[PDB]
Write a protein that binds this DNA or RNA. Structure first.
Lengths: 74, 27, 105
RNA sequence: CUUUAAAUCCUUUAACGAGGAUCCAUUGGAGGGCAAGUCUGGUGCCAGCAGCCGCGGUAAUUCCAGCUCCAAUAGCGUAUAU
RNA sequence: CGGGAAACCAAAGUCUUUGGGUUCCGGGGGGAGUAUGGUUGCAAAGCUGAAACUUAAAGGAAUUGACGGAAGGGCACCACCAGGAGUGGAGCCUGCGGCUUAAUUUGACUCAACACGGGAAACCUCACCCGGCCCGGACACGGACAGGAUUGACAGAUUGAUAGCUCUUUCUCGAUUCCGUGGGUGGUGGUGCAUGGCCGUUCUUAGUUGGUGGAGCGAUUUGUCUGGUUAAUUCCGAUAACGAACGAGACUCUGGCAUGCUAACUAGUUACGCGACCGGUCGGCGUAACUUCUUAGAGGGACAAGUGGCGUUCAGCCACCCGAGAUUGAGCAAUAACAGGUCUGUGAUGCCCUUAGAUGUCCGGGGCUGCACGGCGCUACACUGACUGGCUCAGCGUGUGCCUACCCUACGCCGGCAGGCGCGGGUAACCCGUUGAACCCCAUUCGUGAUGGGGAUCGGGGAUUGCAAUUAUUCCCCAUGAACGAGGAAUUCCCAGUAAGUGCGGGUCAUAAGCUUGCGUUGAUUAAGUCCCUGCCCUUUGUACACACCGCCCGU
């Protein structure tokens, strides 16, 4: 049969753009005049979550995606 | 008796190399 | 073929098919002795093997077919009756004494 | 010196003159006829070879070249007449 | 005798062992017996008669094969005759009659393409056509960061059911590169004219080949045949052939045949223990004798201790008088061949590509479906046919968890039912099951048969173990109405339980068969035929054919 014929469609369209960054610094809660973390925030008492991961605030969607679950208090 | 030229001739008795093989077989 | 004849088989045919000389393929076979091609007594009386040999030009196929003698394990000799093919077993005929008088002890 | 009207060229005597003895042999050909490679690269019924038969259409022993070989050899090929 | 290339010739012999006498005449094929000159003739034309140019052959005899709208024999329902069922017409499944948002033909010179690639693609089908998140570079060595940039059920601004493919938004495993020495990204992409292997076809026909010997200079021939005459190069026989080899046959499996299985809880049963009734529910413990059906499960014989006729009295053939059996159907299937098919079956392999939504993940929708029974499987204008008053039945073969959840299902309930729930049986003669493989009197019940031989099919208890059912597994079933007495231009059917009805299985199968492959109740007085078609085989014969008659070839 004939080939895919998917090369000449979708005109005047561009790919979804994801920002290129070097470090993951501002992704976390860093408003302490030094970028450090305090002990007032609670840690989840469950085993399915990594110890290193900490809660963060993003003015959109959420700091997540593999499980596609919003972790915000809402 | 040499068999290589005999086989080469028996594969095609009237091919491009028939004259040379037949001549080599004579002697 | 000479080995098979010296092995004791009463027939063998081998075929080498493919490219032996030139771009085109020749099927070249040698057969000697006897070889049945039909009927049931080609399973228990003929052994056939097909194999492939690679070459800078391609693949050569080797087909070897062998006849087997009458009695098992390569014709050891007559044994308990398990007939499988036609044979004329001719024993030594009886011989009479030439002398007019019979045996004396 | 000799030669010979004078010369030259041979011949003769010296001096120098050879190791890549660079003091470097060519002309045709390698399928058969007919001697000698269906080795390698390129070309792909093109360019060409081929007196004749034929080779070349993407592994060409036949073309274009490299190497190798062989025929004669200071000679060899070609055209024509015989 | 001898000669000759041989066919042939008692001359075509007495020829390299070449000389009896003499005349004419040829020197590769065409041009061409043409031009021109001469000559003859009333004329037609006759005699003599070139060259330029062109060409590697033209030709003779014989051999093998192929071909013949040549002859003589033989065979075949992939041929015909006699018929039956059939067919783009009076439904259903797909393979062309027509094609450019591809829509279908990738194998065809047929019958050796086309319901074939076991190819029924809602799985990702050869992707197919299309707003498809991909990298499937995770082969070690040109730049190589320490984020190639590797999600989203998501409120018109993120305009598809779990594709942030409109907008510097954007994240709970996350350091993971674009490549020079070798079929590497996926190895279904070529070349099946480079091949193997495996098939198909010539091949359903009976053909094929040495060795020694004979014939011929030789190719080659004889053997391998005049004939009778077999399904048959089968066998008698004849015989410069004799011996052999392959094929055919024999062989294997399979079919309305067994009074032995020192044989069986699945199948009845001699003497036990059951038992109304004119040696029984001992097949309801279990008859070590069983056996008859069943196990076609293991050991057997019987077309000639035969008859008549035809035939060379042989090989054989046609009918039948002590008598179960007097051509079951398949498998295997030779030499030589095809530029037959397959590189999209393959860890069976020769010769290759280089750089971004790579043929491999994502495609809601969808590929032949844009289709009118002159490619398989379908309608009998009728007592041979009806809905169980009739069945103690005639009868292939599958079925579950080892990778792997996805198998066959009995029985109850939801029920008067698709479909759903529940405990149960089954690794299988043990359960489905005594498999619902026709209803023979045929307890709605046929007179001039639009009307039981459709009911030219969409409404209804309610509609699926699987994302997608839109030309499709949905499902249990309901008044005459497009056909009317077997519907012809022409066709890869068919002769003893065959054709043709019907159905049931198996392969495909998460769902599924109007596909294919097997299985069931079915006959003969047959046509005991033929070579007129289409083909094949043998012999003779002709050939200027050998790329072999789809040939060669002639002329305008």
């Amino acid at each position: 049969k004939k080939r895919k014929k998917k090369s000449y469609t979708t005109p005047k369209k561009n790919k979804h753009k994801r920002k290129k960054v070097k470090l993951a610094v501002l992704k976390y809660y860093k408003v302490d005049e030094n970028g450090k973390i305090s002990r007032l925030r609670r840690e989840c008492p469950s085993d399915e979550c990594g110890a290193g991961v900490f809660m963060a605030s993003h003015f959109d969607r959420h700091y997540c995606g593999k499980c596609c679950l919003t972790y915000c208090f809402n | 008796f040499p068999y290589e030229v005999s086989d080469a001739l028996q594969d095609d008795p009237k091919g491009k190399y028939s004259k040379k093989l037949l001549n080599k077989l004579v002697g | 073929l000479r080995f098979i004849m010296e092995s004791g088989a009463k027939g063998c045919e081998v075929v080498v098919s493919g490219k032996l000389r030139g771009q085109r393929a020749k099927s070249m076979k040698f057969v000697d002795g006897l070889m049945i091609h039909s009927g049931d007594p080609v399973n228990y009386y003929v052994d056939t093997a097909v194999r492939h040999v690679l070459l800078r030009q391609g693949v050569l196929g080797i087909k070897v077919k062998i006849m087997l003698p009458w009695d098992p394990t390569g014709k050891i000799g007559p044994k308990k009756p398990l007939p499988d093919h036609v044979s004329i077993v001719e024993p030594k005929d009886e011989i009479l004494p030439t002398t007019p008088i019979s045996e004396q002890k």
